Design a binder for this molecule. Sequence first.
Ligand SMILES: NC(=O)C1=CN([C@@H]2O[C@H](COP(=O)(O)OP(=O)(O)OC[C@H]3O[C@@H](n4cnc5c(N)ncnc54)[C@H](OP(=O)(O)O)[C@@H]3O)[C@@H](O)[C@H]2O)C=CC1
Ligand code: SF4
Ligand code: SF4
Ligand code: SF4
Ligand SMILES: [Zn+2]
Lengths: 107, 45, 108, 176, 342, 155, 54, 42, 145, 115, 209, 55, 96
Amino acid sequence: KVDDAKVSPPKRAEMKTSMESLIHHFKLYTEGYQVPPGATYTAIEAPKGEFGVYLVSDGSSRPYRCKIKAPGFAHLAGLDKMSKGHMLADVVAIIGTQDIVFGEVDR
Amino acid sequence: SKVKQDMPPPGGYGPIDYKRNLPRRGLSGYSMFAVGIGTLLFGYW
Amino acid sequence: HPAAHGVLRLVMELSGEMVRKCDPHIGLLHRGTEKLIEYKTYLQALPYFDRLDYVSMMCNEQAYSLAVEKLLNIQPPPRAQWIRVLFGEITRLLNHIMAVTTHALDIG
Amino acid sequence: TYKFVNMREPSMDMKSVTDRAAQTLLWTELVRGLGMTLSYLFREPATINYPFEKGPLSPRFRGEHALRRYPSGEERCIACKLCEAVCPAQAITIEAEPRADGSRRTTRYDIDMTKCIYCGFCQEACPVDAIVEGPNFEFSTETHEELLYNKEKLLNNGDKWEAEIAANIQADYLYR
Amino acid sequence: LHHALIPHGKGGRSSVSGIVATVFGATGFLGRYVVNHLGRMGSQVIVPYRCEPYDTMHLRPMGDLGQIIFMEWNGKDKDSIRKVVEHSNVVINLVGREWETKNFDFEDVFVKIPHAIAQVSKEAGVEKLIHISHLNADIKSPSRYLRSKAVGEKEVRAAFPEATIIKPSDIFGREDRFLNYFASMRWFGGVPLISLGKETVKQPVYIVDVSKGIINAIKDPDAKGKTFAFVGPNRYLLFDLVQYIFAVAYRPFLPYPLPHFAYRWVGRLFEVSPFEPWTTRDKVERVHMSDMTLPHLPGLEDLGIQATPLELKAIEVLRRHRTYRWLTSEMEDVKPAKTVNI
Amino acid sequence: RGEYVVAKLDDLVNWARRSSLWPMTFGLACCAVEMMHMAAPRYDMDRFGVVFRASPRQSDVMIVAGTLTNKMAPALRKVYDQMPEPRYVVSMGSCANGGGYYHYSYSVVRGCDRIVPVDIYVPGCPPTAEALLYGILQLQRKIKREKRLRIWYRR
Amino acid sequence: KNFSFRIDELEEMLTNNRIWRNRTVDIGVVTAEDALNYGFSGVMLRGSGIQWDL
Amino acid sequence: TQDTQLIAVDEKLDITTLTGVPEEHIKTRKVRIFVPARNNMQ
Amino acid sequence: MELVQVLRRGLQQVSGHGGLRGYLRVLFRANDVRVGTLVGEDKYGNKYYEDNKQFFGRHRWVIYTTEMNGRDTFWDVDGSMVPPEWHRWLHCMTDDPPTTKPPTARKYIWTNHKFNVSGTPQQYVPYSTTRKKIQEWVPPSTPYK
Amino acid sequence: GTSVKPIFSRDMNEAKRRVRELYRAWYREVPNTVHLFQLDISVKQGRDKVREMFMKNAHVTDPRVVDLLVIKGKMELEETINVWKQRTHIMRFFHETEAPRPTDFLSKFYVGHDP
Amino acid sequence: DTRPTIRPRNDVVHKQLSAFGQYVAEILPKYVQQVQVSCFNELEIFIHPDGVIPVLTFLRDHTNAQFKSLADLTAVDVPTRQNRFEIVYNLLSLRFNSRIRVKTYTDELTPIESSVTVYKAANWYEREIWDMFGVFFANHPDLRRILTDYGFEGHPFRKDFPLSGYVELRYDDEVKRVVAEPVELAQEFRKFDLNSPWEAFPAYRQPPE
Amino acid sequence: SATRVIQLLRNWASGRDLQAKLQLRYQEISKRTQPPPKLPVGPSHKLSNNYYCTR
Amino acid sequence: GVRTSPTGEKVTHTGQAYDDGDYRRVRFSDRQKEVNENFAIDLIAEQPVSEVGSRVISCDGGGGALGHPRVYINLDKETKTGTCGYCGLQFRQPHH
Ligand SMILES: NC(=O)C1=CN([C@@H]2O[C@H](COP(=O)(O)OP(=O)(O)OC[C@H]3O[C@@H](n4cnc5c(N)ncnc54)[C@H](OP(=O)(O)O)[C@@H]3O)[C@@H](O)[C@H]2O)C=CC1
Ligand code: SF4
Ligand code: SF4
Ligand code: SF4
Ligand SMILES: [Zn+2]
């Protein structure tokens, strides 16, 4: 983990011995690291698509807005376009070829 | 004591294959057909 | 439905069995995840992303982790990134395993 | 760099075309899946015998909470409330009181599993390793009121589950 | 009042109303809705049961966690009632079977059990007790049912001078076995009725009116000692009852005149059945005999309860028994039977 | 003795019941995919004598696995009421047990028990495939411990 | 080391299979433009020949 | 300020009917605002 | 030759499992006829076996006891009779039996490991662990002043 | 300035029209709603339960809010045409199972600290 | 960075995105208000509400931008502003592997022209936003609830909307189907005012006022 | 870990040497009795010249 | 050590006991109000008090890293015996 103890908890051995580790561990596990104000749209190559998060921080220790980019959301949106002229067994094939998962497509 | 964690072996792990290794089994189409009539013609005799 | 891949209301307006309209009513599972995100701290917010998609466990908070510390102008140690990509690829295997097999399940 | 996945135009050679025709008329690639499936049938099944046999685990496993105590007998918890402040589902409720002696621990320590997430955050948030995620995954029950524990049973759980975690934190105290 | 008993919350699932209910035999129609209202406003309910716990599970999703506690209990064993009614505020008696079984006779469940439940509750020291007895409770009635209610009412009145005896006239609802009785009659060819059922007027009341009247009696500080009679809003002839309900089912009504003794015989063969009987000789007298009016006894409106009309709530039950040809037919298509109300 | 005979027929009934009960192919959230994890050859759902059937007219025990929502609620009660008796319900995971991680959420009902009667509450979030496979076992023991026709005899 | 010998197991079962293919090939198609116009990503674009990977 | 069939609807905005909070929670709720006071030990 | 080799392996199986009675006991209760080394035997009668030659996850297994705390379990069983010292060994959280190195014994640990008491009268009940917070003003004992 | 851009209803008159065809669709919707939806309530109480919701919002003077509400009115309307909602979903309009809310001052004083 | 803790920088990209930021500014001076690239190389275009459909059209069409992918639709709500909801788009250009952010502002009542014509992906993202926040857009094909419960009143993501909601439901046997009631939690959300009373970042501090 | 004759049957029906390595796990795994670790310190664990303003 | 309330139910370590007039006790019927027998009140008093010869001592709680964080307690008050708040065990000067 990052050696910066203000963003990552210190080691247990140091937390029980050194002051700075203990006081940081106490406040990190009661407030959380203060994130500067701003917004970001980091997105990684998810196994489906481009799962990303539009994190928006107000500067406090808690986030303000965090909207989840779901590749399934677009894929399920296009499901209407995919199924056209195909039968009821084929739409069963399509909704699996996009690998729709409903905690993510739905949030 | 020196630092010890989970590390790769000094020579490194073996070569990990990833390509297709699909076997080429069976026999020629002519031979498969010629067998088909071969036992078939036996049948009518 | 077992072919529903979980929960959703997919209404088909079909003649014979040719689907004419396939309106996918979604939200049958809806949890206000982003709303509870607002009230929890970033550390408390980490488990939320682990439960977005049930196919990729740590591919998700990898995005969430990348969201925070890159906004924080902080970078992870080089060894940690190698663990992340190694398990992210293992996680990539995790989804693809039933991205194809459960596909075949509904297929037959 | 990329690898093209699906295009291989089949040769129109007499030998090659009769291969596809033989494959079509005489189901050959079709029986290939049929034939291998036979080979996989003779494999012995990879099924354990539950509960006579239980699956592999690791020392850093998250199960039922169990409040431990010092070797003398005094319970480790010192009501710092860090577990409550971290608990992502607020499954912990803490009240404290200085009673008479060096044993002010909790007026109330209620962990709500049907609310809890089993993230284990309480375990490493504790400065004295009081609350731990036990190695027992097996604590199911029939009533909803059962699935929440009071402070007393956390002590009883730590009392009943004591040897396992004592050795588990023994093996895992350097990793975390 | 008790220290940890003051009412709290806005009458919700997790609120506190201060009522430690002890409904007996809640695994029935009256018990099902009584625990519902008690659970709805928020009140600790102690439900003793004798049958299989599986049948009692449908009362589990009826209140907040730890508000409904299921307890084993037996009528003959005195100590069984004591355990149930010890930590209690109101003990209401809903036990009683429309037919007779080998272990429990009509007097056993309508006099002996009410005698035990009244004596133990008073000895324990509960503040209120509600007893259920038929509105037609009569010592000289031809049916052993109504005689048992009368003496049972007398016993609980003497043992518990503050008990609020409830007198429902003719309960009806989903699983009510009253209109379900005549609805199931279409299976046996026509509809057998004694003298075509033209000399019997009944005043049925739907479940929620008596059910809500129960807790309203619990909440009423002056309800003790009274003998409130819960009666319906309209009176119709017995022929009108069968005429209306068959019309709502759209099944072909086939009136069938019967002599009294032949109907009495029919109950005898149907009582032979080792399983749950369909028709009993006691049921023969009850359906034959007519509902009585007791204006002197306080009714159900005194507790702020409006008697729902039968025609308004009859559709809620008749939909199940009707066929597919009229399954989606509404209730305005049918016309309420001729009311001969007082 | 009559009680001896009824006990013997009682033993016949539950043994068939607990041996041949059929869980519903019902899945909502994170718990559902771990539920089919134990159905995988590692733990072998079927070797305990059960098979997955789909419609309510088909199965024995409802296996609720996932977060319960307000929109999901009407169908779950409809599908549960649609299962013929005898029918049992087990509640996978913290979320379905009651509230769960989203206990305070606006779109989550705090407890599947608030909607449908429940036999067993299997905890864990997600419950390990071992833990719920015991939950099926506990239901087999619970099905064993009944006196349905026995209470009828003494009724 | 053991896993590469298992995708071949799936691919032997399905890819060469005509029964799998008939139900699957040319069943549900997206053009290039409507692929990224609909916001698709990952495999959805890659299957359509779109030269993009994060 | 942007003339697109502008009409002078200058009455006080009333979004309560659209947000639709319950009647007990729109009238019988004294909403109060301030600036929070700093914790004295801090 | 290998065919009759596995036949005698079954003949060894019936012989090694206490003759016919024991084999029929484990076949109808233990659901398995495998024979393993007696790794240990706890105080509750639970008989434990180890077979390192078998594939992973089927090396260490348990034959449950017929009696525990007056809860006769010859036929029915569950995954909770396992005592805490051995529960880690069964789940192979470690490659040491408690017999080789016992856990550190202290005063407060239970002497009789219990199981899920759910359903039984020994089941837990939630209750307030806090005292009363607002006690009421007691009415005066004296009559009208 | 304070002048604002309307969407569909420039003033009260057209907004009054839009609330009118809501009634036009609703009035012929309630009968077969009860018919199709397996409802046990009659048409009579179906009609006026559409009524009082017009007076539930019969105080807004802003045309946009009426227009912001006219879309939702046909939204719940359309949701009822194609049986998308379930019985409980439309029952939520029929306040039936909750305890009656106290109205006079004596009642809320006797209930609790609710103001 | 010789120090391995802090995240490095890509100044080449930061200036390069800034050059394109002013590029769009001259192209559409009517619509953009201010264009800013953050320290972590994220260049955002801030456009006027009424010009939502043209700027998105320009980025999808222009050769030098070629942004044809609607990544996400967000309308982050800030109660302190007059028109609270600020609608934020999200575009990706495949040919220039770069991300752009165009955003507007819109109160609860002002309608926006739906961007379904310029981006078919906006369709379902549109059905969600009106559900969660309540900002109606104009001439959408089938704008209707697709997230919240059937007939669930109130947009839950609004600031005035409590996280616990306003109603809860429960099965009732007296009516034999589920029914709703006012929400009454077993445990309330214990608010945790954990914000540090000491300033955390001198750089982002607002000027005195 | 079975008879040679069926091993030929499985190796010929599947047409591949499965016996070299199987799906199930055996003693090639690492033992779960690891010696205690000696996890390293971080780059900023320097005893001097570690002022926070520089990192 | 666990006592017994006048109603016949064992009291918990915090001293909570259900009143005899209380109604919520019935949850204990056919069940148990189980109480941790090892009372922390009675599990620390009998531990011996140490007699270290120093002014200030670091108490770790035993086990090094496994114990509570090191706390430097002071032993100068002759009338009172020093103790660590984390553990509660006693410390004392060498009789001075
Ligand atoms: N028209 C009518 O039917 C009228 C009825 N009443 C009386 O009101 C009550 C309403 O009962 P209802 O809710 O409809 O239930 P049922 O009459 O359908 O069943 C009897 C009820 O009492 C219980 N019970 C039955 N026999 C016994 C017994 N021997 N010992 C203990 N409990 C027993 C039953 O549960 P279980 O079987 O599990 O014990 C069930 O709760 C009955 O007493 C009824 O006679 C009064 C006026 C009119
Ligand atoms: S794992 Fe621990 S901290 Fe997390 S919710 Fe559960 S009890 Fe609370
Ligand atoms: S369990 Fe640990 S973290 Fe929680 S209050 Fe006690 S000492 Fe603090
Ligand atoms: S309990 Fe946990 S695993 Fe199960 S559905 Fe809820 S969040 Fe997912
Ligand atoms: Zn100490």
